[PDB]
Amino acid sequence: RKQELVTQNELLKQQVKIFEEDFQRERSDRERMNEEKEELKKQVEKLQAQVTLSNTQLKAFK
Amino acid sequence: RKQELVTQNELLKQQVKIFEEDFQRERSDRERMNEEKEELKKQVEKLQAQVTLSNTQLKAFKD
Amino acid sequence: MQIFVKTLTGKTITLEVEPSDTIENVKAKIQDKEGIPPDQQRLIFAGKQLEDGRTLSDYNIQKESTLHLVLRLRGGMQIFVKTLTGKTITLEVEPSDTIENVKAKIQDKEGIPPDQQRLIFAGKQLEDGRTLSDYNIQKESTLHLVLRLRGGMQIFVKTLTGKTITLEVEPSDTIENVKAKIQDKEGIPPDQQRLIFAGKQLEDGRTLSDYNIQKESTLHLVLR
């Protein structure tokens, strides 16, 4: 049992290669997702800002 | 080169298991990222509605 | 001129054919609308297998006629595909086949989306654009298939609790396929499920492109 073993070893090496390829793919997707989360974060930042200013205008006018 | 083959073999099987686990963890974190994005979208809608309500109140009830 | 082609199971297809066409032309139309290669289909009329090269007019074919498709158990060229597990696949291929067409045949056989497949021939990974004659893959040669952990497109589903799962999908996929994946990852029978997107709910007939379900879109699951 020495040749089935070497063929399993080459298959396993290519399997490791494709697995870390997929890992980098998912990491890239997660990076872009973090970018989109930061976009949404800045959006809620300015929304909170205008909410607080309209709140202080309301509280002052009452 | 006979025990070298089986040793490298078992090492490679372990490495594929480990890399699959790391991929699972990265997909977990991707999912949680998406959940955070969802709640941020909800916050966006709510805050825009609140801004609308207060802008209307402001320009209406007071001149 | 319209002609009918029925399978023994009951399936019908309708083809526009001119009487001058040869049986090879009709087999080409059938693979166009069917995928089945011509070296695996035999066409039958009133009991007899029509022979290639002869035209429809040699057999008195007029409009409204009915031919019968019969699949062969094999074509003229097969190769062997080995996995990391111990299973070997005898895949019927044409020599003019691209690597993507071969991966699509692998998908029809075992179900793997082709973007989750990598094929090795004597150390070289095979680009999808190339064909078998490019790599000079002859008949009965052996390839290695390694499977990915993910394709190019994934979507999110919110389960019956607020938890998120991820699905490997193709735009090609119908909502029945999506419900089957949800079953395989969650255990709800597909017709106990309702899928909601953009406030709408998705019938089990149209694909994900028909609803513009883009990558990383978030579906919601409901029990019925």
Swiss-Prot record, chain A:
Effect of residue 22 to N: Abolishes binding to polyubiquitin ('K-63'-linked and linear)
Resulting phenotype, residue 26 to K: In patients with gastrointestinal diffuse large cell lymphoma; somatic mutation; loss of inhibitory activity on CARD11- and TNF-induced NF-kappa-B activation
Domain of life: Eukaryota
Tissue expr: Ubiquitous. Strongly expressed in peripheral blood lymphocytes, spleen and skeletal muscle, and is weakly expressed in the brain. In peripheral blood mononucleocytes, isoform 4 is mainly expressed and isoform 1 and isoform 7 are almost not expressed. Expression of isoform 1 and isoform 7 increases in leukemic cells.
Region annotated Ubiquitin-binding domain (UBD), chain positions: 2-60
Subcellular location: Cytoplasm; Nucleus
Subunit text: Interacts with TNFAIP3 and IKBKG (polyubiquitinated); facilitates TNFAIP3-mediated de-ubiquitination of NEMO/IKBKG. Interacts with polyubiquitin. Interacts with MAPK1, SELPLG and PIK3CD. Interacts with IRAK1 (polyubiquitinated). Interacts with MYD88; the interaction is indicative for participation in an activated TLR-signaling complex. Interacts with HIV-1 matrix protein. Interacts with TAX1BP1. (Microbial infection) Interacts with Shigella flexneri ipah9.8; the interaction promotes polyubiquitination of IKBKG.
Function of the molecule: Inhibits NF-kappa-B activation and TNF-induced NF-kappa-B-dependent gene expression by regulating TAX1BP1 and A20/TNFAIP3-mediated deubiquitination of IKBKG; proposed to link A20/TNFAIP3 to ubiquitinated IKBKG. Involved in regulation of EGF-induced ERK1/ERK2 signaling pathway; blocks MAPK3/MAPK1 nuclear translocation and MAPK1-dependent transcription. Increases cell surface CD4(T4) antigen expression. Involved in the anti-inflammatory response of macrophages and positively regulates TLR-induced activation of CEBPB.
Protein name: TNFAIP3-interacting protein 1
Organism (species): Homo sapiens
Gene, per the UniProt record: TNIP1
Residues included from the entire protein: 451 to 512 of 636
Swiss-Prot record, chain C:
Consequence of substituting residue 72 to G: No effect on ADP-ribosylation
Modified residues (ADP-ribosylglycine): 76
Outcome recorded upon mutating residue 68 to A: Decreases affinity for UBE2R2 in ECS(FEM1C)-UBE2R2 complex. Impairs ubiquitination by CRL2(KLHDC3) E3 ligase complex. Impairs ubiquitination by CRL2(KLHDC3) E3 ligase complex
Residue list for modification Phosphoserine: 65
Record-annotated site: Interacts with activating enzyme: 54, 72
Recorded superkingdom: Eukaryota
Outcome of substituting residue 74 to K: No effect on ADP-ribosylation
Per UniProt, location of the Glycyl lysine isopeptide (Lys-Gly) (interchain with G-Cter in ubiquitin) cross-link in this chain: 6, 11, 27, 29, 33, 48, 63
Variant or mutagenesis effect after changing residue 65 to E: Phosphomimetic mutant that binds and activates PRKN
Impact noted for substituting residue 63 to R: Abolishes HLTF-mediated polyubiquitination of PCNA
Sites of (Microbial infection) ADP-ribosylthreonine modification: 66
Effect of residue 66 to A: Abolishes CteC-catalyzed ADP-ribosylation
Covalent crosslink: Glycyl lysine isopeptide (Gly-Lys) (interchain with K-? in acceptor proteins): 76
More details: Ubiquitin is encoded by 4 different genes. UBA52 and RPS27A genes code for a single copy of ubiquitin fused to the ribosomal proteins eL40 and eS31, respectively. UBB and UBC genes code for a polyubiquitin precursor with exact head to tail repeats, the number of repeats differ between species and strains. For the sake of clarity sequence features are annotated only for the first chain, and are not repeated for each of the following chains.
Family: Belongs to the ubiquitin family.
Full protein name: Polyubiquitin-C
Source organism per UniProt: Homo sapiens
Recorded name of the encoding gene: UBC
